[PDB]
UniProtKB/Swiss-Prot annotation:
This is Papain-like protease nsp3. The lineage of its organism: Viruses, Riboviria, Orthornavirae, Pisuviricota, Pisoniviricetes. Residues 1-167 form the Macro domain. The chain holds residues 1025 to 1191 of 7096 of the full protein. It catalyses: Thiol-dependent hydrolysis of ester, thioester, amide, peptide and isopeptide bonds formed by the C-terminal Gly of ubiquitin (a 76-residue protein attached to proteins as an intracellular targeting signal). The gene is rep. It comes from Severe acute respiratory syndrome coronavirus 2 (2019-nCoV). Inhibited in vitro by GRL-0617. It comes from the Viruses.
Length: 167
């Protein structure tokens, strides 16, 4: 039993809700919140910009030190950093950005990072400003993640479309 509330159950392990991931994280304070990161951990917009703003830029400060030490992530890769005031940990995961010409096949690799954590609050990877089809991202999530994932879909119209089209 966990403290996530109001989610629709899609499969044994995948759950979904129309919600602002920032507001959800502040309420639940989950062990792991997933950020829709880029390889430079530059949290400018989308989920990343919103999560970073909610940390008063502490996420960005921590991320800049991470990059200065380690260099950029790989597309499809991840790193674990602090969750600041939002969660215990933030799993920064880089899905492919179609608006950069990156290989959508890497979306499965990106979701595989979730399997290293028993429970996560997450957005749909590569959706929104990363330019992939959210219906496809949900299919990849369900077919790749085996741990317990609570998906927050900001857009209500998109949320309704994902449920009604879910196979
Ligand atoms: O990952 C892309 C995802 N974006 C967010 N998800 C959850 N919370 C969010 N807060 C700010 C942006 C954001 C899109 C939202 C509708 C479909 C995918
Ligand atoms: Cl977005």
């Amino acid at each position: 039993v966990n403290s996530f509330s109001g989610y629709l159950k899609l499969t044994d392990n995948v759950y979904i809700k129309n919600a602002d991931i920032v507001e959800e994280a502040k309420k639940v304070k989950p062990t792991v919140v997933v950020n829709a990161a880029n390889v430079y951990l530059k949290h400018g917009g989308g989920v990343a910009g919103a999560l970073n703003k909610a940390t008063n830029n502490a996420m960005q400060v921590e991320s800049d030190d991470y990059i200065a030490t380690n260099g950029p992530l790989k597309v499809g890769g991840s790193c674990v950093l602090s969750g600041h005031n939002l969660a215990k940990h933030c799993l920064h995961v880089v899905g492919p950005n179609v608006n950069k010409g990156e290989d959508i096949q890497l979306l499965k690799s990106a979701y595989e990072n979730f399997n290293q954590h028993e429970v996560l609050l997450a957005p749909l990877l590569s959706a929104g400003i990363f330019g992939a089809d959210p219906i496809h991202s949900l299919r990849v999530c369900v077919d790749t993640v085996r741990t317990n994932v609570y998906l927050a879909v900001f857009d209500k119209n998109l949320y309704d479309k994902l449920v009604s089209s879910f196979l």
